DNA sequence: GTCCGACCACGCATCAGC
DNA sequence: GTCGGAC
């Protein structure tokens, strides 16, 4: 029928009757755009999941081969994360394509996008570039997804202009609300309120209600008909856990969907299983606000405390044939990034180890003084085509978990077992491969000292993980089974800074209409200057951000004050009269390549910025001259234990 | 608690304009 | 990475 009247949120949805395309025919992108419209219209995740599940139900029964692109479009993903596909399209490039497609000037389009905080609204309500053009053939979901991959594949010189032509071709073919969601997808801000967890929930519910592998018309279109309310809830929850645990071990829709469409959800765990060479989703941590909050949530359950090393996570896979692969926490292939780790793998395990998967942290290590180097030194390593002899920043590994060992997966094993197998089958080599500094006890006085020792030993804090009660590696049960105890989480850390607001930035998405970010500055007394130190975008409540936008709008200046120095920082949208002083908390102080704050007091050509800055409260009693000085900022950077360790 | 999406610094890798 | 909001 007509995809313009598609309603996937209809009460009592028939996957075949309520669809807007014939069987065997490509799924129209308008059907996807209409589904995105009903999803964004609501705020309850349970209602959003059922709406997406209705689209997926119509897809599996009518056009199975279009299920993969529809899922990728709903996730705003280009493919499996280990393939490293990236659009390579910035906001300015997308805005240039919008202005050219709609026939408007670039400045008019850029002003509307900034004032509306969304490029999708600007790209949709502009049907002037059509001029005298008959409507192009309607967009399909698989065709739109194929164009996205085409844009991501374009590289080399003059590739930006070729990306614009493809984006322009999509816009002139967009009808109704299609332009809003393609521009949102290209900008990386789909803004649906639904993401990976809800897509997985909608997928398992769709294949459970409407099973795949059926002949059309489908004999079974709603497998929850003769079921009670509690019986259907527990059935769908049990089905959603089968898919989630499989995806947690194999986060690859290119591997899961074809197996899902041929054998069903119940046969999935026997075809897709955690194997070396295939990256898996890592165990995440929950921020804890103190020791006492660690004793809660865990309750009467024994746990271990380990050093939280400040580096990069390295998921190292050893295949049965001998090949070695390393993956980031985003399942990105980092094998070519660590040629040293590959050549060192012989010295970390004993001969009777054939295959494994370790969960380690690659930390920048120095062999000259035998000390841990900060995270900024680690990020100076090359990313690809690294020659082993050209490595200038050595790396020491800190293993803390074992997922695979000699052909068997230890995902369903307690940490006590996985840790015990780690120390038995692996040898420690200082400066290269060492076990995470651990400690198993309950004494609060002992734990508090371990937190101080970790910071003294160049670490962010402590990681708290149970040993036997809910101590498995099953992400699908709880993604954040571990706890992180960082010092800067406490109430009396001391690393608070009183900074002056010198600029504001127009907000986007949730922050559209008001300010999304602010420019902060410290006072340099000798130069009589306000030197920008960092930007601030988190820590405000929604009510506080409304008060800030109202009160700071009276201080808006057309030009910056002569004593304000920002150097290389992003020029604020609204220059502000220096008056507001805010207390700001951070985790560390970093040597900045753009920020001029305290430049010349610790480094000759580099200033200081803030690591993980967040807003705390307004300092009404303070004035811009009473704010933190650049001398205090330089003294704070020198007092950092990692800086003192050199 | 869960899930989602606002926002932060930094530096390698990449590309347009010249 | 931190953070707050809707459920
Ligand atoms: O703050 P965050 O979510 O990045 O912390 C989690 C990450 O911290 C790293 N890390 C460092 N030390 C450990 C130990 N001992 N155990 C687990 N993770 C650890 C990891 O990279 C982790 O993803």
Residues A488 and A499 in one domain: no
Tokens 């300092």 locate to: A619
Residues A80, A34 within the same domain:
yes
Residues A605 and A580 in one domain: yes
Structure tokens of A616? Answer: 């705390």
Residues A94 and A239 in one domain: yes
A453 in the same domain as A424: no
Contact A558, A575 (CB under 8 A): yes
* Same domain? A410 vs A479: no
Cα A71 to Cα A76: distance, rounded to the nearest angstrom: 8
Q: Are A608 and A591 in contact (CB under 8 A)?
A: yes
Q: What does the alpha-carbon distance between residue A562 and residue A371 come to, in Å, rounded to a whole number? A: 44
Question: How many CA atoms, within 13 angstroms, populate the side-chain half-sphere of residue A287?
Answer: 7
Q: What is the DSSP letter of A282?
A: P
Kindly determine whether the C-beta of residue A482 is less than 7 Å away from any atom of nucleic acid strand C: no
CA gap A476, A478 in Å, rounded: 6
Quickly count: other Cβ atoms within 10 Å of residue A216's Cβ: 11
Q: Are residues A536 and A519 in the same domain?
A: yes
With CA atoms as reference, report the closest residue to A338 among A275, A387, A270: A387
Strand B nucleotides below 7 A of a protein CB? 1-16
Q: CA torsion sign, A330 to A286 to A511 to A180? A: positive
In whole angstroms, what is the distance from residue A5 CA to residue A326 CA? Answer: 48
Resolution as reported, in Å? 2.4
Alpha carbon distance A29, A177 (integer Å):
10
Residue labelled with tokens 């960082």: A486
Q: Which two tokens stand for residue A31?
A: 């059907």
User: Regarding beta strands A482-486 and A312-318, do their DSSP bridges make them parallel or antiparallel, or are they unpaired?
Assistant: unpaired
Q: Reduce the DSSP state of residue A485 to 3 states and report it.
A: strand
**Under 8 Å between Cβ of A33 and A181:** yes
Name the experiment that determined this structure. X-ray
Residue A313, CB, less than 7 Å from strand C? yes
- Residue A606 near residue A581, CB atoms below 8 Å: no
Whether A281 is in the pocket of ligand 1, judged by its Cβ within 6 Å, is no
A489 in the same domain as A502:
no
Question: Which nucleotide is closest, CA of A161 to its C1'?
Answer: B16
Contact A526, A634 (CB under 8 A): no
First-to-last C-alpha distance (Å) of chain A: 71
Based on the domain organization, do A279 and A319 belong to the same domain?
no
Question: How many residues does this entry show for chain A?
Answer: 646
How is chain A split among helix, strand and coil, in percent rounded to 5? 40, 20, 40
A234 CB-near residues (< 8 Å, 6+ apart): none
A436 in Cβ contact with A309 (< 8 Å) = yes
Based on the domain organization, do A522 and A422 belong to the same domain? no
| DSSP codes joined into one string, A494-553 | --EEEEEEEEEEE--GGGTTSEEEEEEEEEETTTTEEEEEEEE-SS--HHHHHHHHHHHG
Buried b (16+ CB within 10 A) or exposed e, A321-348: eeebbbbbbebebbbebbbbbbebeeeb
Nearest partner of A324 among A334, A310, A311, judged by Cα: A334
Residues A632-644 as b or e (16 or more Cβ within 10 Å = b): ebbebbeebebbe
CA dihedral A485, A466, A292, A448 (to 10 degrees): -60
* Ligand-binding site membership of A460 (annotated): yes
The answer to whether the CB of A63 falls within 8 A of the CB of A25 is: yes
**Does A77 contact ligand 1 (Cβ within 6 A)?**
no
Domain count along chain A: 4
Are residues A376 and A471 part of one domain?
no
Q: Which atom of ligand 1 is nearest to the CA of A436?
A: 15
Tell me which residue has tokens 């390579």: A88
Its domain, for residue A441, covers 285-310+437-494
Does the CB atom of residue A313 touch ligand 1 within 6 A? yes
On whether both A17 and A158 belong to a single domain, the answer is yes
A535 labelled catalytic: no
């Amino acid at each position: 029928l007509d995809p313009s009247g598609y309603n996937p949120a209809k009460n009592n949805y028939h996957p075949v009757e309520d669809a807007c395309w014939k069987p065997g025919q490509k799924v129209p992108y308008l059907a996807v755009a209409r589904t995105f419209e009903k999803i964004e219209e609501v705020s309850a995740r349970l209602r959003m999941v059922e709406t997406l599940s209705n689209l997926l139900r119509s897809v599996v029964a009518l056009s199975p081969p279009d299920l993969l692109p529809v899922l990728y479009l709903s996730l705003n993903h280009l493919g499996p994360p280990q393939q490293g596909l990236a659009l390579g399209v910035g906001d300015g490039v997308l805005l240039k394509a919008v202005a050219q497609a709609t026939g408007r000037q670039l400045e008019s389009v850029r002003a509307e996008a900034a004032e509306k905080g969304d490029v999708g609204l600007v790209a949709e309500n502009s049907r002037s570039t059509q001029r005298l053009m008959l409507p192009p053939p309607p967009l399909t979901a698989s065709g739109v997804f194929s164009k996205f991959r085409d844009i991501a594949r374009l590289t080399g010189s003059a590739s930006t202009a070729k990306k614009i032509d493809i984006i322009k071709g999509l816009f002139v073919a967009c009808r109704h609300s299609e332009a809003r969601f393609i521009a949102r997808s290209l900008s990386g801000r789909l803004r649906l309120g639904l993401a990976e967890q809800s897509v997985l929930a909608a997928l398992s519910q769709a294949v459970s209600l409407t099973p795949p592998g059926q002949e059309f018309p489908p004999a079974m279109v709603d497998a929850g008909k003769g079921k009670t309310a509690e019986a259907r809830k527990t059935w769908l929850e049990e089905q959603g856990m089968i898919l989630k645990q499989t995806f947690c071990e194999v986060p690859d829709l290119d591997r899961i969907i074809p197996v899902l469409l041929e054998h069903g959800l119940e046969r999935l765990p026997e075809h897709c299983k955690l194997s070396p060479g295939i990256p898996l989703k890592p165990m995440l941590a929950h921020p804890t606000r103190g020791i006492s909050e660690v004793l809660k949530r865990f309750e009467e359950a024994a746990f271990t405390c380990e050093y939280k090393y400040d580096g990069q996570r390295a998921q190292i896979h050893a295949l049965e044939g001998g090949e070695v692969k390393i993956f980031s926490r985003n399942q990105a292939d980092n094998t070519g990034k660590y040629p040293d780790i590959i050549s060192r793998i012989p010295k970390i395990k004993l001969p009777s180890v054939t295959s494994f998967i370790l969960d380690t942290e690659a930390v920048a290590w120095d062999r000259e003084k035998k000390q841990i180097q900060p995270f900024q030194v680690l990020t100076t390593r090359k990313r690809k085509e690294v020659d082993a002899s050209e490595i200038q920043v050595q790396v020491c590994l800190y293993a803390f978990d074992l997922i695979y060992l000699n052909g068997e997966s230890l995902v369903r094993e307690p940490l006590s077992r996985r840790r015990q197998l780690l120390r038995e089958n692996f040898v420690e080599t200082e400066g290269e491969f060492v076990f995470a500094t651990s400690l198993d006890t309950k004494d609060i006085e002992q734990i508090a000292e371990f937190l101080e020792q970790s910071v003294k030993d160049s670490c962010e804090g402590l990681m708290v993980k149970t040993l036997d009660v809910d101590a498995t590696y099953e992400i699908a049960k709880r993604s954040h089974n571990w706890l992180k105890l960082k010092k800067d989480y406490l109430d009396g850390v001391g690393d608070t800074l009183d900074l002056v607001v010198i600029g504001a930035y127009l907000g986007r998405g949730k922050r559209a209409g008001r300010y999304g970010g602010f420019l902060l500055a410290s006072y340099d007394e000798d130069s009589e200057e306000l030197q920008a130190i960092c930007k601030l975008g988190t820590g405000f409540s929604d009510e506080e951000l409304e008060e800030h936008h109202q009160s700071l709008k009276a201080l808006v200046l057309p030009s910056p004050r002569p004593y304000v120095r920002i150097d290389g920082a992003v020029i604020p949208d609204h220059w502000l009269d220096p008056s507001a002083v805010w207390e700001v908390k951070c985790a560390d102080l970093s040597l900045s390549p753009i920020y001029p704050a305290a430049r010349g007091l610790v480094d000759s050509d580099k200033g200081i910025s803030l690591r993980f800055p967040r807003f705390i409260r307004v300092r009404e009693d303070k004035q811009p001259e009473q704010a933190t000085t650049s001398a205090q900022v330089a003294c704070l950077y020198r007092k950092q234990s990692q800086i003192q360790n050199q």
